[PDB]
Scaffold this active site. Structure first.
Site, mmCIF file in Angstrom:
data_model
loop_
_atom_site.group_PDB
_atom_site.id
_atom_site.type_symbol
_atom_site.label_atom_id
_atom_site.label_comp_id
_atom_site.label_asym_id
_atom_site.label_seq_id
_atom_site.Cartn_x
_atom_site.Cartn_y
_atom_site.Cartn_z
ATOM 1 N N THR A 1 0.831 -1.200 0.000
ATOM 2 C CA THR A 1 0.000 0.000 0.000
ATOM 3 C C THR A 1 0.875 1.262 0.000
ATOM 4 O O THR A 1 1.803 1.394 0.796
ATOM 5 C CB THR A 1 -0.915 0.037 1.205
ATOM 6 O OG1 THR A 1 -1.548 -1.236 1.341
ATOM 7 C CG2 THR A 1 -2.003 1.059 1.068
ATOM 8 N N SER B 1 2.730 -7.684 0.985
ATOM 9 C CA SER B 1 1.706 -7.105 1.865
ATOM 10 C C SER B 1 0.376 -7.051 1.157
ATOM 11 O O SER B 1 -0.120 -8.146 0.790
ATOM 12 C CB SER B 1 2.285 -5.828 2.513
ATOM 13 O OG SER B 1 3.391 -6.243 3.339
ATOM 14 N N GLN B 2 -0.217 -5.904 0.896
ATOM 15 C CA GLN B 2 -1.454 -5.918 0.110
ATOM 16 C C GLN B 2 -1.253 -6.635 -1.238
ATOM 17 O O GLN B 2 -2.161 -7.269 -1.744
ATOM 18 C CB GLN B 2 -1.946 -4.467 -0.133
ATOM 19 C CG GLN B 2 -3.307 -4.494 -0.781
ATOM 20 C CD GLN B 2 -3.940 -3.197 -1.158
ATOM 21 O OE1 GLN B 2 -4.881 -3.212 -1.983
ATOM 22 N NE2 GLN B 2 -3.496 -2.063 -0.652
ATOM 23 N N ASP C 1 4.832 -9.076 13.429
ATOM 24 C CA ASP C 1 4.168 -8.266 12.421
ATOM 25 C C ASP C 1 2.721 -7.989 12.852
ATOM 26 O O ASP C 1 1.999 -8.921 13.185
ATOM 27 C CB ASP C 1 4.209 -9.078 11.123
ATOM 28 C CG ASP C 1 3.739 -8.339 9.899
ATOM 29 O OD1 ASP C 1 4.448 -8.447 8.852
ATOM 30 O OD2 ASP C 1 2.681 -7.657 9.937
ATOM 31 N N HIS D 1 7.101 -5.955 9.319
ATOM 32 C CA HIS D 1 6.347 -6.024 8.067
ATOM 33 C C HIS D 1 7.130 -5.544 6.875
ATOM 34 O O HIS D 1 6.750 -5.948 5.779
ATOM 35 C CB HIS D 1 5.079 -5.234 8.248
ATOM 36 C CG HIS D 1 3.957 -5.403 7.302
ATOM 37 N ND1 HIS D 1 3.413 -6.626 7.002
ATOM 38 C CD2 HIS D 1 3.235 -4.483 6.625
ATOM 39 C CE1 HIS D 1 2.425 -6.438 6.152
ATOM 40 N NE2 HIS D 1 2.269 -5.149 5.901
#
EC number: 3.1.1.72
Length: 207
Positions: free
Chosen positions: A13, A90-91, A175, A187
Site C-alpha cells: 500500500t 503485503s497488500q 508483524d 512487516h
C-alpha cells in the site's frame, strides 16, 4: 517472443508505481534466469490515501485481484508454455493470494470465492511468493515464519489452497498486519529476511 519464465510483482500500500518491496524477490528471480522478464501489477495499492488515488483498501484489493487475474490470464494465453512466478508484498500478497487460491476476501467485501486465474494460468504458475500477506493464518502448509496467529484478513481455520504446493508465504510473529504482533518494522523487512528462502523455493519449482 515469449520468455521461458515471466514474473509478476505486486507492491504494498502507497508504494510508488512498480514493484515496491516485491522487487527483492522479483530481481532475485530475474538475475537467476537471464532472459526472464517481469511486469508489475499496476493495481491501486491504496488504503484511502490521496497519493495512491484514494481507493479504499477494499476497493484497492478488489481491483488488484482483478488486475492480477487479467494480467496473468492474458499473459498465459499469449505465452502458454511460459512458467510464471508471482511475488506479492503485503497488500500485493493479499491480492495474489485471492487470485490464485480463491476463497474470496470476506473482510474486504470480495465475495466471489472462485480462483480468479484461469485453469491454464494456474497450471503455469510454478511458484508464488507472498510476504506480509494480511490473509496469513498460521497452520497452512505453504507458510513460513514465526507467526503462530494470523493477520487482519486471515484465512479461516480449515482453509486450503488448491495451489498450496506452489506457494511460500512468509510472516513473523511481531508483524501487526500479517500476524498479531506489535512491531510494524517487521512487516517491511521480509525481502532481506526471506528473499533467499523465496528464491530457493522458486528455483526448486522452476528447475
Amino acid at each position: 517472443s515469449c520468455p521461458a519464465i515471466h514474473v509478476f510483482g505486486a507492491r504494498e500500500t502507497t508504494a510508488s508505481p512498480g514493484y515496491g518491496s516485491s522487487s527483492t524477490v522479483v530481481n532475485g528471480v530475474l538475475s537467476a534466469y537471464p532472459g526472464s522478464t517481469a511486469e508489475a501489477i499496476n493495481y491501486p495499492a491504496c488504503g484511502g490515501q490521496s497519493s495512491c488515488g484514494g481507493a479504499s483498501y477494499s476497493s484497492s484489493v478488489a481491483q488488484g485481484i482483478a488486475a492480477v487475474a487479467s494480467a496473468v490470464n492474458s499473459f498465459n494465453s499469449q505465452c502458454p508454455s511460459t512458467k510464471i512466478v508471482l511475488v506479492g508484498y503485503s497488500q500485493g500478497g493479499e491480492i495474489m493470494d485471492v487470485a490464485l487460491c480463491g476463497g474470496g476476501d470476506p473482510n474486504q467485501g470480495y465475495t466471489n470465492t472462485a480462483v480468479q486465474l484461469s485453469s491454464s494460468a494456474v497450471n503455469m504458475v510454478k511458484a508464488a511468493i507472498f510476504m506480509g500477506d494480511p490473509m496469513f493464518r498460521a497452520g497452512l502448509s505453504y507458510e513460513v515464519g514465526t507467526c503462530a496467529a494470523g493477520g487482519f484478513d486471515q484465512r479461516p481455520a480449515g482453509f486450503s489452497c488448491p495451489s498450496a504446493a506452489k506457494i511460500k508465504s512468509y510472516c513473523d510473529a511481531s508483524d501487526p498486519y500479517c500476524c498479531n504482533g506489535s512491531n510494524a518494522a517487521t512487516h517491511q523487512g521480509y525481502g532481506s529476511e526471506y528473499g533467499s528462502q523465496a528464491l530457493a523455493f522458486v528455483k526448486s519449482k522452476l528447475g
